[PDB]
Amino acid sequence: DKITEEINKAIDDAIAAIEQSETIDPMKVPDHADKFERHVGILDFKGELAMRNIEARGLKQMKRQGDANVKGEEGIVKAHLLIGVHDDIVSMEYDLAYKLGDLHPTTHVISDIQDFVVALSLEIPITMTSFEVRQFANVVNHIGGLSILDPIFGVLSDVLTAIFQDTVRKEMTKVLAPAFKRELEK
């Protein structure tokens, strides 16, 4: 109960220190390119895309979700925590160039992430033992100039959602994990 409150306070301090620092909001994401294939009905889409100038905003709203889940075994306190941005949204903006057949346009994209959540684990004999950005519950993609009824939108939005669940989540983990490690293990 007291250990739970101390861990809550330490987590809140880590969050505040990371947010008071730059690089977290807006957060740069390295450029990413990919080939892709999808099948939409009878249409067989094969093409390539590139995402540049990728920026994530909204992580200044990171907030501990509920008490630290604390359990003590063999004189070591273990705690798992969730930190998220559930009331607000984390938005990714980027320039998208894609090639499909004779189409090679560049457009601007806004991708909204719902329920951005980080799972974290601590051990107190504080050492951080686990840190991950959980899979996104939903990614809403707005691709400039494309109708939501366009099959090209369907393909591009599906490929982009997969890229967010893979590359983007890995890059955000790369940035966030050492920041939290530094703040908590001090």
What is the binding site for another protein (CB under 8 A)? Answer: 39-43, 45, 100-103, 147-154, 158
Min CB(22)–another protein separation in Å = 37
- Nearest partner of 29 among 88, 96, 77, judged by Cα: 96
Q: Does 5 bind Na ion (CB under 5 A)?
A: no
Min CB(40)–another protein separation in Å = 5
Task: Tell me which stretch binds Na ion (CB under 5 A): 28-36, 71-79, 147-155, 172-180.
Answer: 28-36
Q: Are 96 and 51 in contact (CB under 8 A)?
A: yes
Query: Quick one: 125 or 145, whose CB is closer to another protein?
Result: 145
Task: Tell me which stretch binds Na ion (CB under 5 A): 47-55, 69-77, 115-123, 173-181.
Answer: 47-55
Task: Tell me which stretch binds Na ion (CB under 5 A): 6-14, 30-38, 137-145, 161-169.
Answer: 30-38
Q: Does 54 bind Na ion (CB under 5 A)?
A: yes
Min CB(109)–another protein separation in Å = 16
Min CB(50)–another protein separation in Å = 18
Q: Does 31 bind Na ion (CB under 5 A)?
A: yes
The count of other CB atoms within 10 Å of the CB of residue 172 is: 23
Chain residue at closest Cβ approach to Na ion: 54
- Nearest partner of 58 among 100, 36, 87, judged by Cα: 87
DSSP label of 115: S
Q: Which does 42 bind (CB under 5 to 8 A by kind): another protein, Na ion, none?
A: another protein
Q: How many residues bind Na ion (CB under 5 A)?
A: 2
